[PDB]
């Protein structure tokens, strides 16, 4: 394993801070919780601190800390994310909603003292004002998915490509194509993995005593494929 892996052997508090602008609809989200990478386990609560979230919460799940994935011992030389810690990594995505707009996101994931922090900027353009996203037509749930990871040695990082299918309230599906790049922030060596994937399962819920717009998320992420 990497030196950074040692930072994740116990429960680590997590902070997420997102500033977004989708078709000019601005919003911010704050999340708090903890991760226990030994179990690939994340428990987080996200709050829209600016009022109503102008997109569906499920569309932000992939943007809202892959360093908490459980890498099987036989695969730990393939865990880029922890290997970049504590200096961190920059995750860049384009998320293309079929027949609608796209998000572009830039996230910096790094330790601030003992807290793993994910700071994100999200920009969404070319959405339909009464499409599935800005019209809030997506169910509040989330299917299991695989994230396929490949090295990008020339960039000293990794890439991923994957499809998320959000459930539309009419029974159909809203595809969100994801293209992702992750690059280290610091200078230290990182682990550049062989091809593999992350298997993710996510449960979305609500805090019955919370009046703000929010999402409670229980998520498990486990590496596989090698």
> What are the boundaries of each domain within the chain?
1-226
CB 176 within 8 A of CB 55: no
47 bridge partner residues: 30, 214
Distance between CA atoms of residues 90 and 96, nearest Å: 19
Of residues 226, 219, 225, the one with CA closest to residue 69? 219
Task: Name, in order, each residue with C-beta under 8 angstroms of 130's C-beta and a sequence gap of 6 or more.
Answer: none
Of residues 108, 110, 109, 106, the one with CA closest to residue 92? 106
Handedness of CA 32, 106, 66, 83 (dihedral sign): negative
- Kindly give the pairing relationship between strand 12-22 and strand 115-125: parallel
Enter the tokens of residue 207.
């805090």
CB 56 within 8 A of CB 136: yes
Method used for this model?
X-ray
Residue bearing tokens 């996230």:
107
CATH class, 1-226 region: mainly beta
Of residues 161, 99, 94, the one with CA closest to residue 124? 94
């Amino acid at each position: 394993m990497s030196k950074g892996e040692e930072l994740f052997t116990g429960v680590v508090p997590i902070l997420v801070e997102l500033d977004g602008d989708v078709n000019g609809h601005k919003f911010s989200v704050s999340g708090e919780g903890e991760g226990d990478a030994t179990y690939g386990k994340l428990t987080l609560k996200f709050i829209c601190t600016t009022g109503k979230l102008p997109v569906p919460w499920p569309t932000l799940v992939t943007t809202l800390v892959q360093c908490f994935s459980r890498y099987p011992d036989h695969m730990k030389q393939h865990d880029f994310f922890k290997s970049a810690m504590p200096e961190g990594y920059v995750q860049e995505r384009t998320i293309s909603f079929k027949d609608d707009g796209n998000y572009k996101t830039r996230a910096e994931v790094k330790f601030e003292g003992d807290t793993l922090v994910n700071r994100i900027e999200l920009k969404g353009i070319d959405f339909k004002e009464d499409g599935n996203i800005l019209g809030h037509k997506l169910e509040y749930n989330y299917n299991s998915h695989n994230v396929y990871i490949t090295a990008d040695k020339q960039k000293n990082g990794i890439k991923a490509n994957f499809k998320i299918r959000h459930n539309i309230e009419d029974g159909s599906v809203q595809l969100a194509d994801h293209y992702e790049q992750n690059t280290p922030i610091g200078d230290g060596p990182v682990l550049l993995p062989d091809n593999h994937y992350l298997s993710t399962q996510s449960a979305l819920s609500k805090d019955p005593n919370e009046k703000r717009d929010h999402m409670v998320l229980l998520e498990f992420v486990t590496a596989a494929g090698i």
